[PDB]
Amino acid sequence: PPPLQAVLVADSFDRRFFPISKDQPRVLLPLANVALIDYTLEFLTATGVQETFVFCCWKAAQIKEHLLKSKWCRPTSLNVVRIITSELYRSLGDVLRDVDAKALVRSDFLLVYGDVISNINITRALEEHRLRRKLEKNVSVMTMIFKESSPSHPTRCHEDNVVVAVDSTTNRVLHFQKTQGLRRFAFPLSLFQGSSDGVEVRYDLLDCHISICSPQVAQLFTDNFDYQTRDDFVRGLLVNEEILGNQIHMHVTAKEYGARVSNLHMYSAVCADVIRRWVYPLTPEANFTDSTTQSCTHSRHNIYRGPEVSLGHGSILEENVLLGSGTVIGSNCFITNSVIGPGCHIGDNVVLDQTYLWQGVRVAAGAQIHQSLLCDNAEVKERVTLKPRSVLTSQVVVGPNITLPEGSVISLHPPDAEEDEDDGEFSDD
Amino acid sequence: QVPTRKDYGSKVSLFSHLPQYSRQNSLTQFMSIPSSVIHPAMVRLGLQYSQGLVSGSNARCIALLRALQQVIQDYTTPPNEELSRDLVNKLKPYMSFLTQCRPLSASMHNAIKFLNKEITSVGSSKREEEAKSELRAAIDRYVQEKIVLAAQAISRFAYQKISNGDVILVYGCSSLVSRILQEAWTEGRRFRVVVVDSRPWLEGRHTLRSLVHAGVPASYLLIPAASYVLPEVSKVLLGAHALLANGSVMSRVGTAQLALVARAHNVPVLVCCETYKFCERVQTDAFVSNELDDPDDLQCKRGEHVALANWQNHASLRLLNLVYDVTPPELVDLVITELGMIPCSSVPVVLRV
Amino acid sequence: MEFQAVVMAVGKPLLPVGNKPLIWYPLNLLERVGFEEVIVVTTRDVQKALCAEFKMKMKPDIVCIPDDADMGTADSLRYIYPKLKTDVLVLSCDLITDVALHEVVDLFRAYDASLAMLMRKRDFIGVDSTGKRLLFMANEADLDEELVIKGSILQKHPRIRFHTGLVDAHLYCLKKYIVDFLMENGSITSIRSELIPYLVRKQFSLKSLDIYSFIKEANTLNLAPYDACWNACRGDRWEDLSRSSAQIVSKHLVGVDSLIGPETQIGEKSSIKRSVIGSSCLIKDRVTITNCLLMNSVTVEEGSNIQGSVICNNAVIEKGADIKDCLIGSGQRIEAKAKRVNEVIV
Amino acid sequence: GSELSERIESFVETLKRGGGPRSSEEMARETLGLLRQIITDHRWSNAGELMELIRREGRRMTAAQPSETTVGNMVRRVLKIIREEYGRLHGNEDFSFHYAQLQSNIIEAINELLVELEGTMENIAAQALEHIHSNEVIMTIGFSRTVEAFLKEAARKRKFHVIVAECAPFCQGHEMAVNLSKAGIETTVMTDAAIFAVMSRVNKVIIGTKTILANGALRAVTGTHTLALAAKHHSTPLIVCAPMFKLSPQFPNEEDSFHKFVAPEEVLPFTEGDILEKVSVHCPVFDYVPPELITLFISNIGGNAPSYIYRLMSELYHPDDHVL
């Protein structure tokens, strides 16, 4: 049983965190005061993975610097993250091309993205996948790891839903398609025509992007120089089943958990879903990134607490908070479902709901905040109010006596936002 | 004749007086496809009971009364046999068939008692049509004045006893308590609700959805964790399948445990129930008159393979799962009815007279 | 009554062609489980006399009505509607199985269904995850190479196990108001083709209309082909004996497992390869097994042996019996014929 | 040698991720093997430096999994061993008065402790026969291999019914009852929603426990608080069949995260759907039995009331080691 590689392709190439990602890659956003790269690194370590050949192109300097001050840097570790960086590639296709180049892996890696949030022990799937190999001698190329969920869960936004026509006797995939604005579907009869002994149209599956693979996946990505992702990879491999079949094999795990954030929406879900211990072991206060900055103390209603918080007087914490180090909160305050971060300084009489505060932010009095991200040091003056998903990032300020509309993406760059940084709502420069 | 279905598996010693059927082998496996001996309504009704497609107390009572209206409406009076007597002597085998499918809860018992007292109060001075219309209208009015207006008055009472900021606790599925919670939330009371559910008929999720799809902040947790949340609970609000004669409220298989731990942590228990579940009988504990779900359904799919798969092969092993449990009148503090907030030991003295 | 077990039969004769009366088989399956009085429907294509051969039925009580030739099952039921005053349990005359029919009726009664069919392992039927309720079914007409699955049903019943090689047993416990709808509408000429797909499709039309479909591995119905009857009687030799029995035979020859009954004169040194020794058969020579069909008025001798050759009513074959899968119809006074298993016509 | 470093680190990693090894006695034996390894592969000549060393690993461990009291109090006990042997040899300050002789003595004492720790199931099992008088109905709960050994030892000379609740978060009572009936005990599985209806008909309540605090009050697999509270409403005698090392010297509300909340997936699986947005699901695995419901701890020294358990602290752990 040779070791288990893990081709951690740690830079989501299709840009969807704008303007957020322009500062630090999404692979370094703080999910709950922890970097997504660390969540996936701890996941890969948990399932017994020797090497984690993390690949990065954009801002790879920052990622390498953050991974050198990690728990996976010191050579006593078992997950020898052998970072590898180039600027050329911009798609997982190009990344598997890079794998063809350096010929790193030898068998059975895990094409994990950078932002996977999971505790999925893949030993069962790996074992039966190697049995699938040894029986019919390597035609079974990939082996995705989907999760049984329900098509109305918040971690299934109107974008990521997938429909999979899959065999049932052996969980072999037959047809895959997204649901980016459909009301019907279409399944070529080739599935049945091959073997109509029984299929299934599974649409409770949630994509998890934990694809086991093979060196043959490197071969099949270097043969077709037009493939540009894993979605498109399987979507193009599933059609030519009679020329070197190379048949995928689905897999379900119903008791585990695993997601992959791809926007502020799915990010809100996976964050305020990690707070509720849904992914345990990888809860916050386990402090798997064993550093003194965010170690935390549980409580009723999961209202966590870091060191030196010094909450106010008569301020309540309904549920699912995660206070941070040194983050003072004034009196008569009110927080709920938020995820505060290390270093904040919240005012008095403030009200926070589902909100986010990454670090250094300085929210002021009277400030009503709901369902909104607030990235690094996005200080905020008095008598403000926000509205759903009103993400304001990157040192931006907001002046006194000022509201914001519903979807208010603002930033320090005027063009990338829908506003511009200043000490006011309008007239930012 | 109407046959008698077999039992399933070796029971427990102390329960050698109770029947242990099996959801799988339905009774109508040995029945006549055209509804011969038992009216089509009653055979369908019993078939869906033994299949567990009707769960609540009020659900069972209403499914029954609909079946009975179906019988009465499509009834043919035999040659020169009196209705007042042939009707009841024809309904007796249907009752035995239902009891064969799933043992009649106290609600169905009170409904049958009332219906037989109702039929046997008609004479020969009535046509078939007028008496039948009177029976159907009387059943309609019984439903509208014992399980529809009753719930109204019960909710309007238990709303005045629900103040703000107090995490009301509940148990499993129910109809009256969910109506109470949703109505009282509509009137403005900003509380929480701590749903407690049990295995294997995880009847908590029904009230869970019917709550969270109405706004109230829920918090779902299994039953072996009651002793965790009861510190901050401020009222318990249970359901009541049967209000016995001593006051010892019989209900789903865990209400006793809950009432006990919630009297230990000192949080006042309530039981809300209408004036038609006052089962005239009385019992002491939950061993003399219960049911038994098909025990083969206990086996939980935890881990990779169930530990009770070959449940029968092991000789000494003997599953069970009761269906009813009894809170004595000491652990209980409130019985809410359309008569007011009567105390649980003054059940037989007002629910009777 | 709850049910009214109407039976359909739409096209020598073709309905009662077998070891025992074929229509009796559904009639017996009706009688095994209650069902005193059971409507029937006969035709005019082959004759206005099906009933005129249905008078010796060894059953306690029946009802019979004929109709025209090219009348679809939906059209026939539409016609029969006047005497159909409750739920309906359609069937088909060419159905020969050991179905635990209590089960399908249990489905219809339990779930308060609206169309309880019966299937047994072109038509793609998407059944739900529980193995019972069905949500999709369509043939290759309304679709080229794909299966448009409406998004709502997938978002409401995610797992949908499909099934292809499912021989429909053509049982359909409908409900009354379905038949009322069928009587008002007229653009429908087959329940199994244009109504049942319509009900499946409109199942998400609250007071919805469920629809269920039990599956099993027990036994089939006799489809259209003259061929399937062979394997039908093949399995039936063993099936029917569960209730040969009494006949007039020679009791000398060597062979079992075929049509063994009265109304024939045979000799000895003869085998029976699941063949058809029907009515008025006669073979007196040293004949052997044939694994073929010998219908009414049979006659063969001089070393008679066949291999699947259908010999219909009025059978007289002699002059060097060499027969193989070569069907020859009525008026079969054909002897000198080296029959081949190549393309042959009756 | 860095081999000790990698071993300790793998150990604490396994403790954070998921129980290793599973059997509590096996985890105590592994903890002791590791602690012995520290006393053979590090740099120390004093006793104070070794106490600081042991505290520097014990803090890491008892802060890894706050509900792994086994390894915590095992470190406490090796500290007590250090105190005792250093004090008896040399002798309040610890000085490097002498050398390896002390280390040989420490290794010998740890070997003795480990030998007493590996043969405790058999001790309690031999102590059973005196307790399970024939024709009882012994109500266990959960799956505690000490209680299974106890009962399938006592039922080699008597006969008695055995109710067994199953823990409803995730059912292990099933496996205990299956292992029991493979010895013929006439056992009765049931979900623990019915601990109060089928308690009046119980004679003696035999429960394991994960950890005994120093009130006597314990921390045991969930739903055992309500079982004890019922079996005290019905005044049946509890029996906490716990060996002596499942004994941490903390005190009931002197510990945060007393319980151990696991992924709420087991209580309301993810397959559920939308309603998983507005529900705070709690899956407490361990519950806090107060000390006045218990009656009789059955430890490897014999039976003991709860009011003797405090004395065991004074005879097993040093009073300045209750903070590790």
Numbering used by the authors:
A (entry chain J): 40 to 468
B (entry chain H): 166 to 518
C (entry chain E): 1 to 11, 25 to 134, 155 to 238, 258 to 295, 342 to 444
D (entry chain D): 8 to 98, 119 to 351
Sentences from the paper on this structure:
eIF2B is an ~500 kDa decamer, assembled from two sets of five subunits (Kashiwagi et al., 2016). It has two catalytic sites, each comprised of the bipartite ε-subunit whose two domains embrace the nucleotide-binding eIF2γ enforcing a conformation that favors GDP dissociation and exchange with GTP. Engagement of unphosphorylated eIF2 in this catalytically productive conformation depends on binding of the NTD of the eIF2 α-subunit (eIF2α-NTD) in a pocket between the β- and δ-subunits of eIF2B, ~100 Å from the catalytic site (Kashiwagi et al., 2019; Kenner et al., 2019). When eIF2 is phosphorylated, the phosphorylated eIF2α-NTD (P-eIF2α-NTD) engages eIF2B at an alternative site, between the α- and δ-subunits of eIF2B (Adomavicius et al., 2019; Gordiyenko et al., 2019; Kashiwagi et al., 2019; Kenner et al., 2019): a catalytically nonproductive binding mode that inhibits eIF2B’s nucleotide exchange activity (Kashiwagi et al., 2019).
Compared to the αPγ and αP2 complexes that contain two eIF2(αP) trimers, the rearrangement observed in the αP1 complex, which contains only one eIF2(αP) trimer, is subtler. Although the eIF2Bα2 homodimeric unit is displaced following the accommodation of eIF2(αP), there are negligible shifts in the other parts of eIF2B, including the regulatory cleft between eIF2Bβ and eIF2Bδ (the average displacement of helix δ-α3 is 0.6 Å) and the pocket for ISRIB (the relative displacement between the βδ heterodimeric units is 0.4 Å). Therefore, the aforementioned rearrangement induced by eIF2(αP) was accentuated by accommodation of the second eIF2(αP) trimer. The β- and γ-subunits of phosphorylated eIF2, bound on one end of eIF2B, have previously been noted to block access of a second, unphosphorylated eIF2 (bound in trans to the regulatory domain on the opposite end of eIF2B) to eIF2B’s catalytic site, on its bipartite ε-subunit (Kashiwagi et al., 2019). This mechanism favors partial inhibition of the catalytic activity of eIF2B when it accommodates a single eIF2(αP) trimer (state I in Figure 7B).
